[PDB]
Amino acid sequence: MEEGMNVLHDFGIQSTHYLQVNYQDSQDWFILVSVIADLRNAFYVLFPIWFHLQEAVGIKLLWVAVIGDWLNLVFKWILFGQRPYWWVLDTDYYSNTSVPLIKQFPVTCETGPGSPSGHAMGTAGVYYVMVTSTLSIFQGKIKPTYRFRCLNVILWLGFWAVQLNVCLSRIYLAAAFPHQVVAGVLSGIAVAETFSHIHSIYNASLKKYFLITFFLFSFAIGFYLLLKGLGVDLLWTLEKAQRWCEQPEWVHIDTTPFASLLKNLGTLFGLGLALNSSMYRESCKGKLSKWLPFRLSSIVASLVLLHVFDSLKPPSQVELVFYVLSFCKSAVVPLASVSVIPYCLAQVLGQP
Ligand SMILES: O=P(O)(O)OC[C@H]1O[C@@H](O)[C@H](O)[C@@H](O)[C@@H]1O
Q1: Residue 184 Cα: closest atom of ligand 1
Q2: Structural domain tally of the chain?
Q3: Which residues lie on this side of the membrane: Cytoplasmic?
């Protein structure tokens, strides 16, 4: 079976080399694409706008993002994926021949397993959710049967253009293989379609949120400990993304599996706290609820303040402190977006 993996890996290496040699002028564009395709944006800028435009779409988007990322982490641990930027320097394949010369970039060195691709899955799920929601909302046009079809065609072309751009960006930076991005896209599509039939998430008590979060934490930690007690470790990539990196400062703690898990669980718990609170009821379910200026002000403030607040970086000297502070920091963005800032605007606008 290893021959097939070698064949796909060699095809990915050749694709990366061709893209890097024949299109040397597009490195800035692909770096920008990879930066934009981050889930940080999905949690910081995409969620507030959709939540303050239509609550159900925002809740669905956040749930899809968090659950898809958790499933991605679990399947990354299960599948034992690889990356080109250390495989090309570690493999025995290019022994009787010449090693292809692929170049590494500051946003290339990643400390997690390869398949499935996280960027492709995370972007596919969120953008499918947004496109489907928009198409569902706009079934009210003046002249139908050609204008609605025009909008449908335009949106479904844009979605696939975005997906192709993200796949090419991940391949160019020598961070993923061509099959991993396709698998990630299909998995994100499947997850976004599966959450279209689950309805016991829009009105859930804090007890259910707490139990779901604790189960998600405990399953991952128990999986890690159970495997660690049987002779296999799921953190083997931290020693491969360290020697095979051109510069030492390019390897960051922010991309480790524990950091991602803690951030996801913090976001979910923060949403659970924000939804079941007195401030949320007093602000988002009052007289200034559907008023357009209030919602626009909420979007603007929750964008500006969140952008400024993202500049507070927890210390990385001690790993446990970093993890707990990452959880606490990720638990705040739902809170500030949903409960606090709308409350402040409610006591500002309607209290003269
Ligand atoms: O492996 P990919 O597809 O290049 O993306 C990996 C990224 O996927 C994201 O889901 C994780 O939060 C990041 O920590 C990780 O770096």
Answers
A1: 3
A2: 1
A3: 50-60, 139-147, 203-209, 276-291, 342-352
